[PDB]
Ligand SMILES: O=C(O)c1ccc(-c2ccccc2[N+](=O)[O-])o1
Protein backbone atom coordinates (compact mmCIF):
# COMPACT_ATOMS: atom_id res chain seq x y z
CA UNK A 1 0.00 0.00 0.00
CA UNK A 2 1.26 3.47 -1.00
CA UNK A 3 2.27 5.22 2.23
CA UNK A 4 3.07 8.81 3.18
CA UNK A 5 6.55 9.16 4.68
CA UNK A 6 6.90 11.00 7.99
CA UNK A 7 9.28 13.98 8.37
CA UNK A 8 11.67 11.57 10.09
CA UNK A 9 11.44 8.95 7.35
CA UNK A 10 11.82 11.63 4.67
CA UNK A 11 15.03 12.78 6.33
CA UNK A 12 16.34 9.22 6.32
CA UNK A 13 15.43 9.10 2.62
CA UNK A 14 17.46 12.27 2.03
CA UNK A 15 20.48 10.54 3.57
CA UNK A 16 20.04 7.33 1.58
CA UNK A 17 19.37 9.26 -1.62
CA UNK A 18 22.47 11.38 -1.08
CA UNK A 19 24.66 8.31 -0.60
CA UNK A 20 23.34 6.70 -3.78
CA UNK A 21 24.03 9.88 -5.73
CA UNK A 22 27.53 10.06 -4.26
CA UNK A 23 28.40 6.57 -5.52
CA UNK A 24 27.74 7.85 -9.04
CA UNK A 25 29.83 10.98 -8.40
CA UNK A 26 32.68 8.86 -7.01
CA UNK A 27 32.80 6.38 -9.90
CA UNK A 28 32.81 9.02 -12.67
CA UNK A 29 36.64 9.26 -12.96
CA UNK A 30 36.92 5.48 -13.26
CA UNK A 31 34.59 5.31 -16.26
CA UNK A 32 37.28 5.38 -18.94
CA UNK A 33 38.29 3.25 -21.95
CA UNK A 34 39.89 -0.01 -20.85
CA UNK A 35 38.20 -0.53 -17.48
CA UNK A 36 36.04 -3.60 -16.85
CA UNK A 37 32.47 -3.36 -15.57
CA UNK A 38 33.59 -5.92 -13.01
CA UNK A 39 36.18 -3.72 -11.32
CA UNK A 40 33.79 -0.77 -11.49
CA UNK A 41 31.34 -2.86 -9.46
CA UNK A 42 33.97 -3.84 -6.90
CA UNK A 43 34.93 -0.18 -6.60
CA UNK A 44 31.30 0.78 -5.99
CA UNK A 45 30.74 -1.90 -3.35
CA UNK A 46 33.97 -1.12 -1.49
CA UNK A 47 32.86 2.50 -1.30
CA UNK A 48 29.31 1.72 -0.21
CA UNK A 49 30.36 -0.69 2.53
CA UNK A 50 33.65 0.79 3.80
CA UNK A 51 33.11 4.52 3.32
CA UNK A 52 29.36 5.03 3.35
CA UNK A 53 28.83 2.25 5.89
CA UNK A 54 25.76 1.23 3.93
CA UNK A 55 24.81 -1.77 1.82
CA UNK A 56 23.85 -2.30 -1.82
CA UNK A 57 20.18 -3.27 -2.14
CA UNK A 58 20.74 -5.02 -5.48
CA UNK A 59 23.27 -7.61 -4.33
CA UNK A 60 21.05 -10.66 -3.84
CA UNK A 61 17.78 -9.02 -4.87
CA UNK A 62 15.77 -11.70 -6.67
CA UNK A 63 19.14 -13.41 -6.94
CA UNK A 64 21.10 -10.58 -8.60
CA UNK A 65 24.83 -11.48 -8.29
CA UNK A 66 26.39 -8.02 -8.15
CA UNK A 67 26.23 -4.76 -6.19
CA UNK A 68 25.34 -2.43 -9.05
CA UNK A 69 23.85 -2.85 -12.53
CA UNK A 70 26.04 -1.78 -15.45
CA UNK A 71 24.54 -1.66 -18.95
CA UNK A 72 26.41 -0.80 -22.14
CA UNK A 73 25.01 0.41 -25.47
CA UNK A 74 22.34 -2.05 -26.67
CA UNK A 75 21.95 -3.54 -23.19
CA UNK A 76 18.77 -2.00 -21.77
CA UNK A 77 19.10 -2.87 -18.09
CA UNK A 78 20.34 -5.37 -15.52
CA UNK A 79 23.73 -5.66 -17.16
CA UNK A 80 25.86 -7.86 -14.90
CA UNK A 81 29.34 -6.52 -14.01
CA UNK A 82 31.93 -8.81 -15.62
CA UNK A 83 35.70 -8.86 -15.20
CA UNK A 84 36.07 -9.60 -18.91
CA UNK A 85 33.89 -6.76 -20.20
CA UNK A 86 35.88 -3.64 -21.07
CA UNK A 87 34.48 -0.21 -21.85
CA UNK A 88 35.54 1.16 -25.23
CA UNK A 89 35.66 4.55 -26.94
CA UNK A 90 32.21 5.76 -28.00
CA UNK A 91 30.36 3.52 -25.54
CA UNK A 92 27.38 4.80 -23.55
CA UNK A 93 27.06 3.17 -20.13
CA UNK A 94 24.46 3.23 -17.40
CA UNK A 95 25.43 2.52 -13.82
CA UNK A 96 22.42 1.99 -11.59
CA UNK A 97 22.89 2.15 -7.84
CA UNK A 98 20.56 1.47 -4.95
CA UNK A 99 21.86 1.68 -1.39
CA UNK A 100 20.17 1.01 1.94
CA UNK A 101 21.07 3.22 4.91
CA UNK A 102 19.36 3.13 8.29
CA UNK A 103 16.55 1.05 6.81
CA UNK A 104 15.79 3.27 3.81
CA UNK A 105 16.64 3.06 0.10
CA UNK A 106 18.22 5.59 -2.28
CA UNK A 107 17.83 4.67 -5.97
CA UNK A 108 19.45 6.42 -8.94
CA UNK A 109 21.31 5.91 -12.21
CA UNK A 110 22.94 7.90 -14.96
CA UNK A 111 24.57 7.54 -18.33
CA UNK A 112 28.31 8.02 -18.85
CA UNK A 113 29.78 8.52 -22.31
CA UNK A 114 33.12 6.71 -22.73
CA UNK A 115 35.94 8.41 -24.59
CA UNK A 116 35.04 10.31 -27.74
CA UNK A 117 31.25 10.67 -27.72
CA UNK A 118 29.19 9.83 -30.80
CA UNK A 119 26.60 12.39 -31.85
CA UNK A 120 23.90 9.68 -31.72
CA UNK A 121 24.91 8.35 -28.31
CA UNK A 122 25.17 11.82 -26.88
CA UNK A 123 21.72 12.71 -28.19
CA UNK A 124 19.98 9.58 -26.90
CA UNK A 125 21.42 10.22 -23.43
CA UNK A 126 20.52 13.92 -23.46
CA UNK A 127 16.95 13.25 -24.61
CA UNK A 128 16.56 10.47 -22.07
CA UNK A 129 17.69 12.72 -19.23
CA UNK A 130 15.39 15.46 -20.53
CA UNK A 131 12.43 13.07 -20.52
CA UNK A 132 13.23 12.45 -16.85
CA UNK A 133 13.55 16.18 -16.20
CA UNK A 134 10.25 17.18 -17.82
CA UNK A 135 8.58 14.50 -15.72
CA UNK A 136 10.15 15.84 -12.54
CA UNK A 137 8.92 19.33 -13.42
CA UNK A 138 5.35 17.98 -13.53
CA UNK A 139 5.42 16.35 -10.09
CA UNK A 140 3.07 17.94 -7.54
CA UNK A 141 -0.03 17.04 -5.48
CA UNK A 142 -3.19 16.53 -7.53
CA UNK A 143 -1.56 15.34 -10.74
CA UNK A 144 -2.10 11.80 -12.00
CA UNK A 145 0.89 9.58 -12.80
CA UNK A 146 -0.80 8.72 -16.08
CA UNK A 147 -0.24 12.34 -17.12
CA UNK A 148 3.48 12.20 -16.38
CA UNK A 149 3.83 8.86 -18.15
CA UNK A 150 1.99 10.20 -21.19
CA UNK A 151 4.26 13.27 -21.29
CA UNK A 152 7.50 11.25 -21.17
CA UNK A 153 6.36 9.00 -24.02
CA UNK A 154 5.14 11.89 -26.15
CA UNK A 155 8.47 13.71 -25.77
CA UNK A 156 10.56 10.60 -26.39
CA UNK A 157 8.58 9.40 -29.41
CA UNK A 158 8.64 12.88 -30.92
CA UNK A 159 12.42 12.40 -31.00
CA UNK A 160 12.00 9.24 -33.03
CA UNK A 161 12.87 7.08 -30.02
CA UNK A 162 10.83 4.52 -28.07
CA UNK A 163 9.95 3.82 -24.42
CA UNK A 164 10.55 0.38 -22.93
CA UNK A 165 7.28 -0.98 -21.55
CA UNK A 166 8.49 -3.91 -19.41
CA UNK A 167 9.99 -1.77 -16.62
CA UNK A 168 8.79 1.16 -14.55
CA UNK A 169 9.59 3.52 -11.72
CA UNK A 170 8.20 2.66 -8.31
CA UNK A 171 7.34 3.74 -4.79
CA UNK A 172 10.34 3.40 -2.48
CA UNK A 173 11.30 3.59 1.19
CA UNK A 174 11.93 0.76 3.65
CA UNK A 175 11.31 -1.42 0.63
CA UNK A 176 13.24 -1.36 -2.64
CA UNK A 177 10.10 -1.57 -4.77
CA UNK A 178 6.84 -0.38 -3.19
CA UNK A 179 3.60 0.89 -4.71
CA UNK A 180 2.76 2.65 -6.86
CA UNK A 181 4.11 1.64 -10.25
CA UNK A 182 5.39 4.59 -12.26
CA UNK A 183 4.86 3.88 -15.95
CA UNK A 184 6.83 5.92 -18.48
CA UNK A 185 4.13 5.76 -21.14
CA UNK A 186 0.38 6.30 -21.43
CA UNK A 187 -1.60 3.40 -20.00
CA UNK A 188 -5.35 3.14 -19.52
CA UNK A 189 -4.57 1.19 -16.34
CA UNK A 190 -2.76 4.05 -14.62
CA UNK A 191 -4.77 6.10 -12.13
CA UNK A 192 -2.73 7.41 -9.21
CA UNK A 193 -3.13 10.94 -7.85
CA UNK A 194 0.00 12.28 -6.17
CA UNK A 195 -0.01 13.37 -2.54
CA UNK A 196 2.62 15.08 -0.35
CA UNK A 197 4.97 12.67 1.40
CA UNK A 198 4.97 10.04 -1.34
CA UNK A 199 8.43 8.84 -2.34
CA UNK A 200 9.07 7.11 -5.64
CA UNK A 201 11.37 6.92 -8.64
CA UNK A 202 11.16 7.93 -12.30
CA UNK A 203 13.54 5.96 -14.51
CA UNK A 204 12.61 5.88 -18.21
CA UNK A 205 14.44 3.37 -20.40
CA UNK A 206 14.66 4.79 -23.92
CA UNK A 207 15.55 2.93 -27.12
CA UNK A 208 16.99 4.60 -30.21
CA UNK A 209 15.16 1.98 -32.25
CA UNK A 210 12.16 -0.25 -31.57
CA UNK A 211 10.74 -0.78 -28.09
CA UNK A 212 10.90 -4.60 -28.12
CA UNK A 213 13.55 -6.18 -25.90
CA UNK A 214 15.17 -9.59 -25.36
CA UNK A 215 16.58 -11.25 -22.25
CA UNK A 216 19.91 -13.05 -22.59
CA UNK A 217 20.45 -16.61 -21.43
CA UNK A 218 22.17 -15.53 -18.23
CA UNK A 219 18.70 -14.75 -16.93
CA UNK A 220 19.46 -11.07 -16.32
CA UNK A 221 20.96 -9.08 -19.18
CA UNK A 222 18.29 -7.32 -21.25
CA UNK A 223 19.02 -6.01 -24.74
CA UNK A 224 17.03 -4.21 -27.41
CA UNK A 225 15.49 -6.72 -29.80
CA UNK A 226 16.90 -4.79 -32.77
CA UNK A 227 20.18 -4.19 -30.96
CA UNK A 228 19.82 -0.41 -31.15
CA UNK A 229 21.16 1.84 -28.37
CA UNK A 230 19.21 2.24 -25.13
CA UNK A 231 19.62 4.76 -22.31
CA UNK A 232 18.19 5.35 -18.84
CA UNK A 233 18.44 7.97 -16.07
CA UNK A 234 16.83 7.67 -12.65
CA UNK A 235 16.15 9.77 -9.57
CA UNK A 236 14.34 9.18 -6.30
CA UNK A 237 12.02 11.96 -5.21
CA UNK A 238 9.61 13.02 -2.49
CA UNK A 239 6.41 14.88 -3.32
CA UNK A 240 6.14 18.20 -1.48
CA UNK A 241 3.13 20.49 -0.92
CA UNK A 242 3.79 22.42 -4.14
CA UNK A 243 6.08 20.18 -6.15
CA UNK A 244 8.92 17.86 -5.24
CA UNK A 245 12.45 17.44 -3.95
CA UNK A 246 15.00 15.26 -5.74
CA UNK A 247 16.80 13.21 -3.10
CA UNK A 248 19.45 11.81 -5.43
CA UNK A 249 20.64 15.01 -7.11
CA UNK A 250 24.25 15.12 -8.32
CA UNK A 251 26.52 18.04 -9.01
CA UNK A 252 26.32 17.38 -12.72
CA UNK A 253 22.53 17.49 -12.73
CA UNK A 254 21.21 20.52 -14.59
CA UNK A 255 17.98 20.74 -12.59
CA UNK A 256 17.37 22.17 -9.06
CA UNK A 257 17.06 19.91 -6.04
CA UNK A 258 13.80 21.57 -5.03
CA UNK A 259 11.16 22.18 -7.69
CA UNK A 260 8.54 24.74 -6.68
CA UNK A 261 5.21 25.42 -8.38
CA UNK A 262 3.90 28.00 -5.94
O1 LIG B 1 16.11 0.80 -10.50
C1 LIG B 1 15.50 -0.22 -10.14
O2 LIG B 1 14.35 -0.23 -9.66
C2 LIG B 1 16.19 -1.58 -10.31
C3 LIG B 1 17.38 -1.80 -10.84
C4 LIG B 1 17.61 -3.11 -10.78
C5 LIG B 1 16.56 -3.71 -10.22
C6 LIG B 1 16.29 -5.06 -10.02
C7 LIG B 1 14.97 -5.47 -10.17
C8 LIG B 1 14.63 -6.82 -10.08
C9 LIG B 1 15.62 -7.76 -9.83
C10 LIG B 1 16.94 -7.35 -9.67
C11 LIG B 1 17.28 -6.00 -9.76
N1 LIG B 1 18.53 -5.66 -9.45
O3 LIG B 1 18.93 -4.31 -9.28
O4 LIG B 1 19.49 -6.68 -9.22
O5 LIG B 1 15.63 -2.76 -9.90
Ligand SMILES: [Mn+2]
Nearest residue numbers: 096097107108
Ligand atom coordinates in the same frame (compact mmCIF):
# COMPACT_ATOMS: atom_id res chain seq x y z
MN1 LIG C 1 17.89 1.93 -10.03
Ligand SMILES: [Mn+2]
Nearest residue numbers: 107169201203
Ligand atom coordinates in the same frame (compact mmCIF):
# COMPACT_ATOMS: atom_id res chain seq x y z
MN1 LIG D 1 14.38 2.00 -9.51
Ligand code: NA
Nearest residue numbers: 072073075230
Ligand atom coordinates in the same frame (compact mmCIF):
# COMPACT_ATOMS: atom_id res chain seq x y z
NA1 NA E 1 22.27 0.81 -22.92
